[PDB]
């Protein structure tokens, strides 16, 4: 085998210590999440509580929510049913166990995307290159049915078939879709769904870390005041030579 | 176990509107390829190269998949440069 | 008990030319008790259940208040007490402080394997890719040893009675470092610390207050550095796949273990004998623990100052620094047949400037 | 309420310091438990192989898991199937849940028997009389139906209805069978299942309470031998009276 | 926590054997209650007494569940006293 | 630290009518140490998770070699930590030992409150009914007290994070009474112990062999009596209601905590007032700790003996211990209102007799 190549480095707009997620692309990632990916991946650790106050408003969450059929109970007869979902539930998953979802997919395993970020090397920007990554095989690279062509994927030979192509979902918001603007979007969405701490975390971070430089100069002061009683101290031996 | 690694010195472009609403229908990427297939040229005839070579041996055996993996690997870091001007 | 700390920590007298070569030794105590405080934090939310362990990590740092906070700050303080060890030994193996601070030597490389034992417990606790297949190869290296692998995991894979056990082992052994610290402090007093000219000398002062600021200084850098990748991630100091649920069949792409065991990692891998791999490993610590005994091994008497300024042939301690960097880059490599031929360069010279450490 | 009446003392076998289980009885009682007991009643920890060389042979053991279907997967497809027990599968449920157990019991729980005789005061005594209890009721006392008046039950009011009736099983060992006999067979059982480990405790025990007992003597006898010389130890004040 | 609580000083009886084996498909506690009832007789008259004193009252309350569950728990420790004597 | 071993385990001298009312202090501490050693071993096969806690001790007992020895003896053991602390006490309040023994006995008094704070955490554990409606009750008598109870708990109700902190306090909790162990020989040592007569003498002998020899002896039947009791189950130490899974909505007929919380649980329940019943439980342990000082009370010099030999009116400690007794029963006992007069009527003795303690 062989290290597989670097991806380039694309500018998004998180990556500065000064800088929170893009909301506006985190919400059309979503969308795209939900009409594309969902039909084959699982975001299991996910719940829509998650995304009230912080992607969209509680009253959209729940038309969202209500839109699916979640199964609960046993009742009082000790039988399972059906109903439409609520705040606390969880986003559903398409198939029961990972054996039921290689069946479908020619016997590979799509994995959950709830760490994904988190999960490969480089992250985001493995992702959005990895989605508009597929190219025709090179002379002599022959595929059997089932396996597809990628520059950024290990090995080259991946059983996604390209998920994305241009004009198949209409934003909300009015932007215009294609391959480009729905990859970058989706990105953004996942990126914050690996940890939807991260802006609390480096907003209490540039507090910290500028009081305690500020101790830092204090405490230099305070030693070089001490330093210095000794460094500019005299020792004459035999008799005093100055005053 | 971080979700992205904070970086120095990003340059961080600003949008470019188009003329008609109707052109961003099509990947941006087709404006910004041919250019960057030209600054990667060194390549694309190493490519081209190797193709001769394999297709003249008897044997079946042979493939340009290093090659292929370099020449594309340089076209979409040229691509990345500026990709993002033209989304939102 | 406080004429023992005013005795120690106030009226101690030290060397006037002491420099930042030696705060290392408080900076690696004031980690421990970081982690002693955050790893407790830790536990009361943690569950050592294998069909559920690697589900409560996630649950504590998404849903609980502050839970991002002691979790990223018990994993990058642990590089960090690894990080002021590798100081804190090298400032010693550069003034050849074990020539009279022959029990503080000793007492220090037992608790460099107890940190050592400590940190190989903690990374399988999260239960990942990395925690079960990391576990499954570094327990079998020690399997020339008859039967030293099957109990202390009490069945017949990594399953989950090893977790619970290495739970209540990762909690104990810490404190019983504290109780070893002791003893490390009660060697060195009994004769008194050094200095950087390697002289005896009578200008001395007093601790408190010119050398305890000096402490405290230090002290901030430490607290900030660790603040600042911990809030921020500016390093990648855990590896991705430890991000994924355990799978019993699938094993990962790349198996690299944390950046403080790759060195030897290497080592272990360039030598293609499984038995003969073993034997090297104990060499290299026996060697160490020889150095206590510098004294005798020749009848010419010795000198601590070692003249390395201005030296062109520099000296050993130097020489085995840029091996040990090599061989991490190897480490973090895929094999190769060219990346093993240099790996094996490298090794002769991490081991052989081991052993001319004890002539002279 | 009131103190409920202790029950009498039967002399079960295992009641003594030195003695075992009934092996035959315990036998006896696992028809019982099969045949009447386990229609309303789980033991979710008990599995087949803790009957092997304890209870029954193997191969016996064998033939009876066989004769219960067990679900298992899922299966390459992703789907559940059946198949015959095996020694490594746990003692057959009645019910999957509790809400269908007391659907089918007038909304009473029959609980489980896996620990019965550790779970209520005086244990195997109070089950041996709860199991011959039921009487009519007194006069001035109408309960209504699903309700039956039994003397040991606390308030007098079980659930529960008569299990036992005389005649009703054929045992394999011949023994005659009646309402006294398949109770006491029956509190064997489940009194053995409530801690197959209870025979190796006690033949420890005695091991080694016999041999502290008589390292306690030795020490007396070393304590004894040193108290001697101070306690017949002669001091004189001004002059010595005696040698 | 334990499944039973040894004793001292328990008697542990010797089998009765049957006449006809077909004897014992009745229940033997039909041979000790007649005895086990006579001996109990102080608490027979006291129910009785008490159900003539309820039968009376004009309103529809009392009952005799008291003397009703004294009565047969004398007989049930009067019986434990022999039962395992005809129990294999 | 063997200069310290000998000076006060081999050298030291003690009066030579000491007798064994003087060994229960050496038998609390070989007790701790035994749990210390059981519970570790439990520790390793426990879960602390909720839905599988109960289970993970069924399975310890039913599955593992010898699970059902160490299970059993740390149950045991744990009822006979307060049995000899018991008679401990009681010898100190029959011989008036507080008299000039004052740090001893308050060191002591924090050692008893830190013993039951830790029994309680441990009952919890086993996750039954008892365990957990026990807890609810036990936790609901400091309502009065402002925010005190959902923070221990960490949620609406004795949930699951309750029972994974619980875990962690119960691991800790008896090392730091280790700790205080040490406090509490200091202060004695600082003295030197008292003698059955109540007088000063100089008919001493050493430690080694003779009292040595003693302390031995009992250490013997100690043993043996807990391994009676864990191998043949001779005593009802436990509720078989724990036995039982939990449910939230279903109470147990008959909530009663283990003997050696019972008469204190009686004393709360006869006093209707939930605010009064709490001021009684602040005013018996003041009481305990005012005895330390009771050289100050009066200006008549006071001394050791007590002089209940062949005496009418008995002490205040015998009459205590019936009151006791009696309560225990009360506790023990379904609610009617004529336990409840007799309860109260023992109450007033319970609660007298401390307080004359304080009169001479
Ligand atoms: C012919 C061919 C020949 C070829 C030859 C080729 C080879 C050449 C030779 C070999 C060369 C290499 C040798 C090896 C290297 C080491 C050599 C050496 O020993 O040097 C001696 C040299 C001098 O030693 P020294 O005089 O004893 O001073 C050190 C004392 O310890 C200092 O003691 P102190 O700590 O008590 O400080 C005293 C002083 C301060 O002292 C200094 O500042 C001195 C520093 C060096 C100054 C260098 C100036 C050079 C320019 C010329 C001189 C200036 C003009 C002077 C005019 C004088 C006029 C009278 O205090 C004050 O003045 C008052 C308070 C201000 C200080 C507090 C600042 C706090 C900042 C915030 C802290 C935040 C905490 C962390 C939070 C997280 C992160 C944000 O030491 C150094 O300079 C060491 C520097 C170490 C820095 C570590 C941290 C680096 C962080 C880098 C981050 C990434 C940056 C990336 C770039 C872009 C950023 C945007
Ligand atoms: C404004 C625009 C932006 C720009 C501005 C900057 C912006 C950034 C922010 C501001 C930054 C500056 C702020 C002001 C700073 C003021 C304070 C200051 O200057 O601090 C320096 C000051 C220096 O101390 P000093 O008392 O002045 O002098 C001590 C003498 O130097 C001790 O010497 P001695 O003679 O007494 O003892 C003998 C011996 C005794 O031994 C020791 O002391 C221990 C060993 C020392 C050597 C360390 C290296 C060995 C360890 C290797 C570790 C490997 C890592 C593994 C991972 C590898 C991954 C690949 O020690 C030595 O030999 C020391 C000399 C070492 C020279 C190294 C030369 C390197 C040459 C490289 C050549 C490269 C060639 C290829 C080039 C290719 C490209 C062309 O240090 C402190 O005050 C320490 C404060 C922080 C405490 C540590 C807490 C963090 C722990 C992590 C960092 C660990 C390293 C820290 C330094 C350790 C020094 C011993
Ligand atoms: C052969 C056929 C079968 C038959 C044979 C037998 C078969 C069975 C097996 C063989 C059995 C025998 C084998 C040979 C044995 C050889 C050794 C021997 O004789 O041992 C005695 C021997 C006596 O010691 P000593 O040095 O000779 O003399 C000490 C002086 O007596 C200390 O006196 P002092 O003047 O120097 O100190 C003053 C004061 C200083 O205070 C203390 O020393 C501490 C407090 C002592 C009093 C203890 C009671 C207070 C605690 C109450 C606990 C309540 C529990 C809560 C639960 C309640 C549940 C309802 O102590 C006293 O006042 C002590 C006198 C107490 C007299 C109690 C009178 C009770 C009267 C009851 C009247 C009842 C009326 C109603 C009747 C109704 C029916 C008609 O003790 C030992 O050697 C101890 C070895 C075992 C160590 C303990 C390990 C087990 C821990 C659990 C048991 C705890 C109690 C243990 C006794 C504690 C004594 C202080
Ligand atoms: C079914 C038609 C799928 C749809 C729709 C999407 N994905 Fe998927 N994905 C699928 C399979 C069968 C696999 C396994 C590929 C293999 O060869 O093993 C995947 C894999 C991924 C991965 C992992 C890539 C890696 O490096 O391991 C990612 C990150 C991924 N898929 C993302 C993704 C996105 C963003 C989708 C919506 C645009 C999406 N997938 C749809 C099957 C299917
Ligand atoms: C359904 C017809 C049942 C059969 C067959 C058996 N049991 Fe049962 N049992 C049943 C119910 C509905 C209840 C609950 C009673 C109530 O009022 O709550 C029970 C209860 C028990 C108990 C618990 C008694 C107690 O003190 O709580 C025991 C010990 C018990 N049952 C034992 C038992 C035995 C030995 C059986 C076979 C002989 C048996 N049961 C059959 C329902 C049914
Ligand atoms: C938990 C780990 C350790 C702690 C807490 C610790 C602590 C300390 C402290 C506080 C000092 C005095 C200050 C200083 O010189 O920095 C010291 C000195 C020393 N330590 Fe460590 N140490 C540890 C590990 C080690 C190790 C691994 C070694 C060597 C293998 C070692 C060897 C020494 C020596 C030789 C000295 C004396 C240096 C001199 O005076 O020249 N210690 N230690
Ligand atoms: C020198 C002391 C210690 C070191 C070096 C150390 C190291 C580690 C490491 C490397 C991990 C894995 C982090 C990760 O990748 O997720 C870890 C996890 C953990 N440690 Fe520590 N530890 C120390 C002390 C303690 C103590 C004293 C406790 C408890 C008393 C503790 C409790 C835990 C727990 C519960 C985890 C699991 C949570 C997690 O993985 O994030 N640690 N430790
Ligand atoms: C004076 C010291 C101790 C006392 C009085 C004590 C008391 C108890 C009690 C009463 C129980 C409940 C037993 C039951 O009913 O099942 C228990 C359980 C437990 N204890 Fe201890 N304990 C002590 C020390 C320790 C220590 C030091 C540890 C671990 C380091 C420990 C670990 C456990 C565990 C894991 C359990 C649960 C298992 C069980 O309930 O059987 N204990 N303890
Ligand atoms: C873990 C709990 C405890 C341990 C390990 C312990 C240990 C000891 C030991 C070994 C002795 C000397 C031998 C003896 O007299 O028995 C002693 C004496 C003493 N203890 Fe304790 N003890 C504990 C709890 C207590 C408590 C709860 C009290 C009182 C509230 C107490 C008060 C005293 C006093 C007053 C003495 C001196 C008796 C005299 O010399 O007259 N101790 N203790
Ligand atoms: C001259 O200067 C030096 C020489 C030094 N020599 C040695 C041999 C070591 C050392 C000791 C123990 C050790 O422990 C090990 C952990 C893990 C393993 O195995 C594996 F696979 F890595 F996990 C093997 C081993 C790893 C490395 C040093 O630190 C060291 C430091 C300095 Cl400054
Ligand atoms: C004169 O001689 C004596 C007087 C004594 N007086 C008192 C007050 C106590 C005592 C102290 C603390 C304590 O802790 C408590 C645990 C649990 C609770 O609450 C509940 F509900 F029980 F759990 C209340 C409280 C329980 C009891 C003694 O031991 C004691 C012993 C002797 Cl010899
Ligand atoms: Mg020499
Ligand atoms: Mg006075």
Redesign the pocket.
């Given at each position: 085998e062989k290290e597989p190549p670097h991806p380039p480095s694309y500018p998004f707009w998180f990556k500065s210590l000064f800088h929170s997620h893009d909301i506006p692309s985190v919400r059309r990632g979503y969308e795209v999440y939900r009409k594309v990916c969902a039909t084959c991946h699982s975001m299991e650790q996910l719940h829509f509580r998650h995304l009230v106050g912080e992607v969209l408003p509680e009253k959209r969450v729940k038309q969202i929510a209500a839109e699916y059929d979640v199964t609960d109970g046993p009742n009082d007869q000790g039988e399972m049913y059906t109903r439409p979902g609520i705040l606390g539930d969880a986003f559903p998953s398409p198939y029961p166990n990972e054996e039921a979802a290689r069946y479908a997919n020619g016997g590979a395993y799509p994995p959950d995307l709830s760490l994904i970020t988190a999960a490969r090397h480089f992250g985001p920007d493995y992702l959005m290159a990895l989605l508009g990554g597929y190219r025709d095989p090179p002379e002599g690279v022959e595929l059997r049915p089932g396996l597809y062509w990628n520059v950024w994927f290990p090995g080259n030979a991946i059983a996604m078939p390209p998920p994305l192509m241009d004009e198949m979902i209409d934003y909300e918001d009015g932007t215009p879709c294609n391959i480009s603007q729905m990859s970058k979007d989706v990105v953004n969405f996942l990126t914050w769904a690996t940890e939807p701490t991260a802006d609390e975390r480096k907003l209490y971070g540039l507090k910290c870390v500028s009081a305690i430089a500020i101790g830092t100069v204090l405490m230099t002061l305070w030693w070089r005041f001490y330093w210095a009683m000794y460094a500019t101290r005299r020792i004459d031996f035999g008799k005093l030579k100055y005053l | 176990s971080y979700p992205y690694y904070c970086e120095f010195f990003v340059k961080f472009p600003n949008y470019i509107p188009p003329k008609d609403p109707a052109e961003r229908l099509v990947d941006p990427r087709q404006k910004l390829e041919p250019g960057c297939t030209a600054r990667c040229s060194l390549w694309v005839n190493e490519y081209d190269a190797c193709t001769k070579r394999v297709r003249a041996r008897t044997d079946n055996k042979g493939n340009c998949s290093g090659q292929y993996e370099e020449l594309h690997v340089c076209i979409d870091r040229c691509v990345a440069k500026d990709i993002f001007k033209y989304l939102k | 008990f406080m004429s023992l700390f005013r005795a120690h920590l106030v009226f101690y007298r030290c060397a006037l030319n002491l420099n930042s070569?030696?705060?290392?030794?408080?900076?690696?105590?004031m980690?421990?008790v970081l982690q002693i405080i955050t790893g407790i934090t830790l536990a009361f939310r943690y569950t050592s259940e294998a069909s559920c362990a690697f589900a409560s990590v996630q649950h504590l740092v998404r849903e609980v208040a502050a839970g991002w906070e002691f979790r990223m700050l018990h994993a990058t303080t642990a590089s960090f007490?690894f990080l002021?060890?590798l100081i804190?030994?090298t400032?010693?193996l550069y003034?050849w402080?074990?020539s009279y601070?022959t029990t503080?030597?000793?007492?220090?490389?037992?608790?460099?394997l107890?940190?050592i034992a400590t940190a190989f417990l903690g990374y399988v606790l999260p239960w990942g890719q990395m925690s079960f297949w990391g576990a499954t190869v570094i327990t079998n290296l020690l399997s020339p040893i008859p039967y030293l692998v099957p109990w202390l995991l009490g069945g017949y894979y990594v399953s989950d009675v090893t977790l619970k056990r290495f739970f209540v082992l990762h909690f104990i052994l810490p404190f019983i470092?504290c109780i070893?610290?002791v003893l490390?402090?009660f060697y060195?007093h009994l004769?008194?610390?050094?200095?950087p000219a390697g002289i005896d000398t009578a200008l001395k002062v007093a601790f408190y207050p010119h050398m305890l600021m000096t402490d405290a200084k230090c002290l901030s850098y430490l607290i900030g550095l660790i603040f600042l990748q911990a809030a921020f991630g500016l390093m990648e100091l855990s590896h991705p796949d430890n991000s994924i649920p355990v799978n019993r069949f699938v094993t990962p792409l790349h198996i690299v273990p944390e950046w403080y065991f790759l060195a030897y990692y290497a080592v272990l891998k360039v030598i293609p004998s499984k038995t003969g791999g073993l034997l090297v490993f104990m060499s290299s610590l026996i060697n160490?623990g020889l150095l206590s005994e510098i004294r005798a091994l020749n009848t010419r008497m010795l000198i601590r100052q070692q003249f390395m300024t201005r030296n062109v042939v520099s000296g050993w301690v130097i020489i085995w620094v840029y091996s040990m960097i090599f061989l991490i880059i190897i480490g973090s490599a895929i094999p190769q047949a060219t990346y093993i031929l240099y790996g094996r360069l490298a090794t002769i010279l991490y081991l052989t400037t081991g052993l001319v450490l004890c002539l002279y």
């Open positions: - | - | 070569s030696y705060n290392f030794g408080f900076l690696v105590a980690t421990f007490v002021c060890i804190h030994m400032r010693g003034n402080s074990y601070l503080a030597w000793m007492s220090g490389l037992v608790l460099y107890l940190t470092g070893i610290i490390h402090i060195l004769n008194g610390s050094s200095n160490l």
